[PDB]
Ligand SMILES: *[C@@H]1O[C@H](CO)[C@@H](O)[C@H](O)[C@H]1NC(C)=O
Ligand SMILES: *[C@@H]1O[C@H](CO)[C@@H](O)[C@H](O)[C@H]1NC(C)=O
Ligand SMILES: *[C@@H]1O[C@H](CO)[C@@H](O)[C@H](O)[C@H]1NC(C)=O
Ligand SMILES: *[C@@H]1O[C@H](CO)[C@@H](O)[C@H](O)[C@H]1NC(C)=O
Ligand SMILES: *[C@@H]1O[C@H](CO)[C@@H](O)[C@H](O)[C@H]1NC(C)=O
Ligand SMILES: *[C@@H]1O[C@H](CO)[C@@H](O)[C@H](O)[C@H]1NC(C)=O
Ligand SMILES: *[C@@H]1O[C@H](CO)[C@@H](O)[C@H](O)[C@H]1NC(C)=O
């Protein structure tokens with residue numbers, strides 16, 4: 001298999017690029033805000049539940 | 050102008066190509082550079098227009114031999130002009146070829162647009178006093194031609210030895226059939242996304258009083274067998 | 290290599306389609322206007338530098 | 339009344355429609371006629387779609403013409419190799435033909451799959467323009483045609499949709515002298531929605547996309563502050579409608 | 585390197601795309617939002633910033649009554665973006 | 681082997697060209713909307729109003 005050049009490292013480069021892109025996707029969707037907010041325990045929201 | 054170590058015979062580059070040598074007979078350092086190859090491009094107007102033809106020699110200049118050098122390369126058969134026109138046929142690096150006026154092929158520098166100097170002042174504003182209803186056309190493709198290739202009929206046309214030797218290769222045939230089936234299902238999902246926006250089918254009333262606007266070209270005329278409109282009937286006859 | 294049909298022509302079709310699309314990309318981004326403008330030499334822009 | 343609302347949607351007072359209704363109807367009908375003639379004259383206006391048809395047909399022609407390749411075998415025709423050789427001797431050439439034709443199918447499926455991704459991206463764009471340019475009115479600049487979008491019209495096409503974007507292009511400009519405010523009695527007067535213009539003598543207020551002058555009254559404008567902060571405040575009398583009434 | 589692998593030049597050179605972005609900046613400064621919708625209509629630049637403050641709901645008195653502070657914040661932000669492109673090439677990695 | 685190498689190069693160039701086309705359609709849309717106009721779309725033309 002070592003006589004077929006740089007196929008294997010290229011395949012691992014492609015799959016690692018895919019995985020890094022997946023963490024980029026799920027970070028760019030959800031991490032829109034840099035302060036975790038909380039609702040107060042007194043829930044007077046105008047009547048909405 | 051390189052300088053080897055006193056035993057070294059030749060040289061390499063990053064690409065593991067011999068970029069330099071030392072002469073074996075006399076102690077001097079030569080330099081291998083490959084011979085000037087490159088692509089040949091044929092710039093043409095339509096054969097339905099003319100038969101005058103220029104020829105582009107990419108990446109090399111006019112060593113070989115209206116013969117002029119561009120950054121795209123040597124260019125024979127073209128006539129350089131100190132004017133600047135709208136780009137017609139691209140060549141490369143801001144140079145476009147065109148079949149202008151007796152009519153021969155010119156090659157010039159691309160004009161990016163009409164030069165303009167907008168007036169500006171602390172006190173000057175330009176308010177429009179009139180207007181114009183412009184109606185513009187955008188043409189976007191929605192779906193593609195559905196296609197399935199039976200891989201066993203393609204590779205082995207009516208054969209049973211070939212079918213068995215194809216069976217030795219596992220499941221490539223079903224993989225290709227499955228990928229083309231996924232494409233052909235996407236090509237109907239596309240048209241159901243674009244067109245089928247509205248569930249109720251609406252229809253226009255027969256008394257068409259629209260304040261003065263004439264919608265006849267775009268609304269379907271039911272006198273035709275295929276109940277489609279004039280502009281759609283022109284559009285279905287310009288794509289072959 | 291001649292006995293493999295037209296693999297080379299197909300690879301050159303692909304790379305040519307890519308090159309034409311790169312010129313389409315740069316012209317769709319930058320060539321938005323068709324009249325080239327120039328600022329006046331007196332830059333009295335309300336105080337913005 | 340739809341186009342009264344659709345002129346209000348581009349910042350134009352809807353009297354501009356009703357006081358120009360026949361001229362707008364004639365411009366719309368003449369532009370529809372220009373589209374019909376511009377399509378019936380030139381047959382290459384639908385090139386976005388012919389590129390799809392021609393590229394897909396070239397891919398199929400390539401897939402067909404790979405059948406006449408030898409790929410290292412004695413012949414491209416399988417039946418020659420079957421009829422002329424032993425059952426052990428023919429399988430080597432048959433393996434070469436099977437390997438080449440399977441490489442051809444993998445190339446065609448990969449190419450079609452990438453091309454399908456491009457068609458899907460343009461189909462998502464066309465669905466967005468159907469939902470936003472046609473089915474509503476978009477404030478997105480030069481998304482629904484160059485100019486200010488008024489309404490948009492879908493028409494079918496072979497393997498594609500065609501949008502007719504009715505827009506608004508302001509035509510006849512005219513240089514005016516403007517000022518950011520009016521100093522009246524030590525107060526600053528800012529326009530409510532519009533811009534101050536002056537023909538040379540008297541100061542007017544007009545909306546920005548059509549020149550219709552209004553005599554500056556206390557209900558065209560908006561008092562805020564004093565005459566010493568705004569850079570360029572000028573002197574004119576603001577009309578007061580209560581003054582010829584009391 | 586030179587085993588058949590020829591790099592073609594782009595059609596628009598870097599001077600042409602720089603003249604295009606020059607035209608875009610001169611259009612947005614001298615006209616504003618109007619040159620992309622027909623002809624270019626001259627507007628003094630304080631009125632562009634006032635009619636862009638009206639576009640976000642802020643009353644346009646806030647611009648004219650704070651024009652110098654807005655000018656200083658804009659020029660200081662341009663200086664900071666020059667520093668972030670002159671001392672750091674981290675965001676440009678998206679191109680690299 | 682060399683033909684598989686060249687075809688692998690071509691396939692990855694087609695995929696990367698498609699990715700570049702998607703980002704250049706973002707760039708053309710942002711010239712048409714952030715530059716030539718004044719956008720109301722939230723966080724499309726920067727963080728804020
Ligand atoms: C909201 O709904 C849940 C389930 O319907 C209910 O248990 C809860 O009491 C509701 N909240 C209030 C404030 O009534
Ligand atoms: C092509 O050329 C023929 C004669 O050379 C001419 O009759 C025809 O009009 C041309 N085609 C077009 C589209 O003009
Ligand atoms: C080719 O280009 C080189 C470098 O620009 C120049 O020295 C040489 O003279 C050119 N050859 C011809 C034939 O013009
Ligand atoms: C274009 O102008 C340059 C400089 O004046 C000159 O050298 C050249 O000969 C001109 N081209 C033609 C075709 O006359
Ligand atoms: C506006 O232009 C039209 C022609 O397009 C003309 O008939 C009309 O008189 C013009 N209106 C004004 C107010 O000048
Ligand atoms: C509308 O325009 C078409 C153009 O052919 C014409 O034939 C038709 O008579 C017109 N109808 C009305 C209502 O003006
Ligand atoms: C604008 O900034 C440059 C450098 O930041 C400076 O040289 C120039 O004098 C400034 N102009 C004004 C009017 O402050």
Ligand SMILES: *[C@@H]1O[C@H](CO)[C@@H](O)[C@H](O)[C@H]1NC(C)=O
Nearest residue numbers: 168169173175510511512513
């Ligand atoms: C406005 O003024 C500029 C500069 O003086 C001039 O070029 C332009 O033609 C004028 N336009 C009108 C409509 O007066």
Ligand SMILES: *[C@@H]1O[C@H](CO)[C@@H](O)[C@H](O)[C@H]1NC(C)=O
Nearest residue numbers: 536537538539540541542553
């Ligand atoms: C400007 O308009 C006013 C309208 O009240 C008119 O009296 C005046 O003569 C006009 N001036 C010019 C220079 O057109």
Ligand SMILES: *[C@@H]1O[C@H](CO)[C@@H](O)[C@H](O)[C@H]1NC(C)=O
Nearest residue numbers: 170171172333335569570571
């Ligand atoms: C008008 O231009 C003069 C110089 O010609 C300048 O001093 C003044 O500030 C400008 N007007 C405004 C409102 O900035």
Ligand SMILES: *[C@@H]1O[C@H](CO)[C@@H](O)[C@H](O)[C@H]1NC(C)=O
Nearest residue numbers: 521522523524565571572573
């Ligand atoms: C405008 O009027 C005020 C008084 O209402 C006066 O002080 C000021 O000088 C006037 N502006 C000019 C430019 O003369």
